[PDB]
Amino acid sequence: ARTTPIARYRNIGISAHIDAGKTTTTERILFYTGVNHKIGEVHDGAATMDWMEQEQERGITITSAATTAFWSGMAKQYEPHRINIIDTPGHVDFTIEVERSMRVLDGAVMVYCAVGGVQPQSETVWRQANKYKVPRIAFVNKMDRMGANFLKVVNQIKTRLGANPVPLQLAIGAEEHFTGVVDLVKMKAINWNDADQGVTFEYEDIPADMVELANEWHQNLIESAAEASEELMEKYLGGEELTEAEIKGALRQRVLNNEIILVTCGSAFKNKGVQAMLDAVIDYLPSPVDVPAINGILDDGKDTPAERHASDDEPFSALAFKIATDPFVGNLTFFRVYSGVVNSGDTVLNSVKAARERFGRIVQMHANKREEIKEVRAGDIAAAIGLKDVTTGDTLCDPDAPIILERMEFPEPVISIAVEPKTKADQEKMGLALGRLAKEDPSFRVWTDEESNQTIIAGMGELHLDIIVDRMKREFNVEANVGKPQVAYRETIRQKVTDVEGKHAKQSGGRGQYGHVVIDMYPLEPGSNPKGYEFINDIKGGVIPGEYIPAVDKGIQEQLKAGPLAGYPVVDMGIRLHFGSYHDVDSSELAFKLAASIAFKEGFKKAKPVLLEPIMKVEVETPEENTGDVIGDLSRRRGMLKGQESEVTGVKIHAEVPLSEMFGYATQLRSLTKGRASYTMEFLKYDEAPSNVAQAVIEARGK
Amino acid sequence: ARYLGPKLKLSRREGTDLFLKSGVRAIDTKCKIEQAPGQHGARKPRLSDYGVQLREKQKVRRIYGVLERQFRNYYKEAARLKGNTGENLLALLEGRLDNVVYRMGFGATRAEARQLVSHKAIMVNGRVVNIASYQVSPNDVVSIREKAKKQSRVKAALELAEQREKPTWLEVDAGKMEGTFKRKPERSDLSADINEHLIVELYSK
Amino acid sequence: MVTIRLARHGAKKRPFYQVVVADSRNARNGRFIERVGFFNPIASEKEEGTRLDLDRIAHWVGQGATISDRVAALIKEVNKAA
Amino acid sequence: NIKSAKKRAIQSEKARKHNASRRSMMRTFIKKVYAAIEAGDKAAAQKAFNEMQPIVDRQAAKGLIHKNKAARHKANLTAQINKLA
RNA sequence: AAAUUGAAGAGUUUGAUCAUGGCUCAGAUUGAACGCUGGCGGCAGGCCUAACACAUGCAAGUCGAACGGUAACAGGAAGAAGCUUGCUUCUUUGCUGACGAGUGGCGGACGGGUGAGUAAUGUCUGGGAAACUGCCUGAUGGAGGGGGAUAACUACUGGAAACGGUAGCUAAUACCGCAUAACGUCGCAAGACCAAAGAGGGGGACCUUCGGGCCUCUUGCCAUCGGAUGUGCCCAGAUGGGAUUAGCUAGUAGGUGGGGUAACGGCUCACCUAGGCGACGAUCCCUAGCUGGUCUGAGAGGAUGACCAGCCACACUGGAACUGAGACACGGUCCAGACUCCUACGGGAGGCAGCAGUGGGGAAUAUUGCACAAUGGGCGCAAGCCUGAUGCAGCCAUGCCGCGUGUAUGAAGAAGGCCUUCGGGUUGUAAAGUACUUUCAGCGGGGAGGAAGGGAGUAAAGUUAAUACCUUUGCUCAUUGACGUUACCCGCAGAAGAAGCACCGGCUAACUCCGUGCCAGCAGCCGCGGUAAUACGGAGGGUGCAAGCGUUAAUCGGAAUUACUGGGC
Ligand SMILES: Nc1nc2c(ncn2[C@@H]2O[C@H](COP(=O)(O)OP(=O)(O)O)[C@@H](O)[C@H]2O)c(=O)[nH]1
Ligand SMILES: [Mg+2]
Ligand SMILES: [Mg+2]
């Protein structure tokens, strides 16, 4: 039945900052597990993981791809373990892709660069891992690049991210002279071989260029893994060194609780270091049953609604980490079975969506490539064609299984732009595409606000929104140019009041009736009422027919409803009919509303209203070094501010800025803050602004 | 598929009694049955040839509780059949199961007979039929099922089935809850006001 | 191999086969040389469930026509002993 | 291919090789008889006809050609050799 | 016996009339679409356009009772693993069940698809002669004897794969000669010539080289004449429009001889004649699969060829063939093209108009489903295996049919609406209220039939030489249904969960008010609206149909308006 025992299952992720070596290392992995014949390189576009056309050209990974391998060991020490690796993007534009993937993975290998180490996306992913609480190990790649420091990078992790790291392999030699690594357990040096692409290596004599720090850090290591129990410590404090095996099992334990992180160093591009990390993925990372069970909600919660022992015997339960788009079936849902067995054709129940789904073609994957499999065991990551309702993060399970899994949380789109097919009428074709791609990214949203006719596309980043646009030109092909969102202006009287009036000679003898009103304008104030359509009924001269005395404010609503000044609605405006004229035979309503319409028109000009644009309450966090520049930029924009507040890990800025303003604020923020800031817009009360555009957009139609 | 509305509206639109009500109270005392149901019913629309044909056809449809589809079928058959088209049509209309139920009691109205047929409260020769259009065959017995027998409504309908022209083709048993269909009604065994030839020309127009 | 097989006419969930002597190539419902009686599988009534045409079946099987499994079973049942 | 109709492809090729062998041999014997008949030696042509006859009849038996084709060869050749004198 | 019994008009030219004449409406029908609305069941239906391009998954295998054999599982055999001479399981042995790959046989030409091509090489009807036909069936026989290979395999080897090399082999129902065969072929005759294959089951012997030999039966093999079947061929009639297509044709028409075909044939070659077709429409051009039938019609006729069935044709485009009884071959070969995919860059793979499905095009057409339980089909001694045939299920009011959405009662003829001559009327027994029922939906429980068979045991005979072993025909036994939470039946609760669409000037059934004022708008036709609009919009009311309604599109009718029936100058 089960090809590989659950204990011989590793589900790992490669998350790190941009260009940290995450994709290259997976290529070295696909090479040193024999699954791929050529090592490859990203700049050449050769990398398999980047299958997407954009990813090949830009070298960027714009999606997470999952692949598996069998690393028996570096010495064929173990029977082949199936390492499920989910390589992830590190571009903050695509942040769902790391988190969508992160909940599913059991362990994380977080890459770092020896020149830089912790860089901004690196903290971002660290935070993501902490929320899904993945036990982590680390690979510090680029140790073949000047500025390379294993030691310094370790400190960087401790100083910045917050993690306390235990060295596993120190480094033999400098950046150009990176011969290989020194284990702090085997006490060996795996000097790799240049002629072969790292395929062969030699365990060596631990030379004196580096034989002394090794002792210090080996000693520092024992102490920390020995920091797992007094049974180790009583012997450790017995002055005796505990066995490496007790250290390695102790190591696996400390990683599970996240007490320590294990740091491995190598150079994927230099084809060195990669084979050992794949070995240490076996050594400390968690197997599906090497930690406690998935938990659940049952029937609005229970004592232990789900304590699903990940097993080939427990009832089927899963999570759809990702929905992806395939043009021929129309979807591909990536699922990890937390507990259970599912087979081709098996029905599943969408615990979250309360529905029935049939799994038509379960497949396994090598990035883009897919291999159909009849059944999926627990702890296996697979892609399911034939599933049409599962949202990213929605549990798919057998009936009577947990309703809710922990992955119900996702980021908020930060950039908004609008789009138009060249052909004005390809708008639905364009529209459907935006929708499909919106299913795949819970972070790409398409809402065509009905205030204006514009199609609005919201996304986590400027690249994302562009990577999300070339996909439309390429798949679901449409040609579309992006632009600016429209303007949601409004208006209100300032203070002026009169006894204005309107009148048509509806009689003429033959016509037979007429209507006329004397009105009285006032504003309330910008934001005193919930009911912007304020009013007072007074009339006691020319008292219009009674059966529609109260029915003569709602017909007037259709002026406050939209557009008196420049095609923009009114707020807080108060109308007051006091006099008028009529005759109670049949005072025609549809031709009496002309009196009301000219009453509004004349009333508006005399009252000198104003125009108030949309302005919101922005809230920003940023490092306490970029305050001057972020506030200077807010100042360049028409922004007021709110809070003289400084956080402890930064500074919380509060600012009132326009809504037509701040187009592309996020990218400007990242630019001037070193991609280390977030923000939000609260849609606060509208405020007036002197604008050359408010009248040029109605003088566009002139009179 | 059933006219759920004011039956007396229909009746006084026809002017005549469609018997869409039980005999508990007179027709005038329940509805002002001389004027059309409208606010302009007091007025008089001068008749047209189509007018009287449609009105007779609708009278028959409203009497028997049949809709225009399946009434066109009751004409298609009895046009295919042999004999007089209109007579065969009236026979095919009296053969309906709610019809024979009504004419044998068990329901004071065709709609009560429809509910009787539909609620599996009837048994054409033991076999529970619940198709209100079941064209009952001669030499056949329709029997009320037990638990439908002795319900309050069936008894009242058996009692009220008198004061009415006794059908020359039924042989009810009134409490034993049997009732036969000894032979199909011929022409003269019915109201004789229904001019079936009008309907025939309506449908052959 | 001219067969004598059932032809599966009727309706959904209510079959009614027709014993047809047809070349074994043509489709079940398709072309046939001659029909020799019918067979109603679902009949549970006074009306005859099956009826064959034995003199012509014998003519065919003397000309070498193969008899299907159910048509053999129906010749059995037509005979009193079976 | 797709199915195991590739096996039939191999078998058809092999049978074509063999049939071409035998059909070439048979047609060569008939070429001999025709060259004799256009040479005029009724007795040499007769020997050639009696040499081809068992070949062509054996081939017809094998199925490489038809009984009718073998008989047609023999009839044509008898007619020719008889008018050959 | 019955197999029919069937034919309707109206509006509109006019100040009015009668004719002529067109337009329009009333009907029936649809693979429909759109709008609004939508409860259920049954049976059907479902890419009409791009024969446009196709990812993926299935759509053709089977036989160990032809053979060499042993890759996988199992049974055993020898154990000096495991061990308490083992129940606590080590390897070798095809030995046996069995079986991957391989040789071989049969199938793969069926079934499934689409209608591009095809105006006649096709189809339909009716005849005909110059033919072949696997499997199926009948009749008579044979079924001696022998050889050389060859895959699989071993070796070495090459390749990324696909897929190979190069020697050594190893069988056969694979191949080949011989012997033998005549109511078989050729030949007027004489005469000459042609085939084969064996496998399985048990057994009284009795013989061995535990190979078996031998006796049987069960199948299989070769030949010939038959049948059935299927197929090929010929003929006549009929089968579209255009003459704003009148000449066309040179293998062309025929004759002779050779060749070819299963078969006749310019089918073909070489001569020879100069014919042949054509106003009964040749030739060309456009269009088109044809038929039973479908719609319509009183008919005659008109339109059509979705479903279903018969024939034809095509398989990405063009060509050729090979194997074979059958093909010039959907899921075979080769080549040329365009296209797509794989590649380690050296090469390689493919053809959804099979079933689902995607894109696209379009007003518009469904699931990447479940079983082979039925019936068929291939293989097989069977068991069985395979079947996107087929049976079922899903989606969609797409159609037809059936049912429900309550029934009886109920005059303060309520309130409210609307009209009003201000009295009232209408909504309206309508509601509410009262009584009763619970179809269907929803829960819960029972539960046919599609299931025949097949298999194991049994007995009887037939069987032989033998109560074995095979049949065949009964008896018993356990059983086989995807649909399926089946149909249907029973109980539970309560009128709860279930009504909309169009219309109301005349044609045409069904009217008032208000607001509007030749505006906005309506209109199938006539026409409506410029101050009292039943023609627009709303409201109240009414009429028709109803889980549909209306609109658009399409066919016939009405239209005697292409008049053959059945018209006119
Ligand atoms: N010098 C050096 N370059 C490296 C190393 N690993 C990866 N790279 C290069 O870094 C660039 C981006 O690496 P990649 O793995 O695509 O980045 P990611 O996909 O963002 O992790 C590529 O050019 C790699 O060649 C290394 O160890 N040393
Ligand atoms: Mg780059
Ligand atoms: Mg990358």
Ligand SMILES: [Mg+2]
């Ligand atoms: Mg209906």
Ligand SMILES: [Mg+2]
């Ligand atoms: Mg299958």
Ligand SMILES: [Mg+2]
């Ligand atoms: Mg085998």
Ligand SMILES: [Mg+2]
């Ligand atoms: Mg079709």
Ligand SMILES: [Mg+2]
């Ligand atoms: Mg040999």
Ligand SMILES: [Mg+2]
């Ligand atoms: Mg042989």
Ligand SMILES: [Mg+2]
């Ligand atoms: Mg000749």
Ligand SMILES: [Mg+2]
């Ligand atoms: Mg013509």
Ligand SMILES: [Mg+2]
């Ligand atoms: Mg065509």
Ligand SMILES: [Mg+2]
């Ligand atoms: Mg006519």
Ligand SMILES: [Mg+2]
């Ligand atoms: Mg195509």
Ligand SMILES: [Mg+2]
């Ligand atoms: Mg051939």
Ligand SMILES: [Mg+2]
């Ligand atoms: Mg084929």
Ligand SMILES: [Mg+2]
């Ligand atoms: Mg195909």
Ligand SMILES: [Mg+2]
């Ligand atoms: Mg379209």
Ligand SMILES: [Mg+2]
């Ligand atoms: Mg079968």
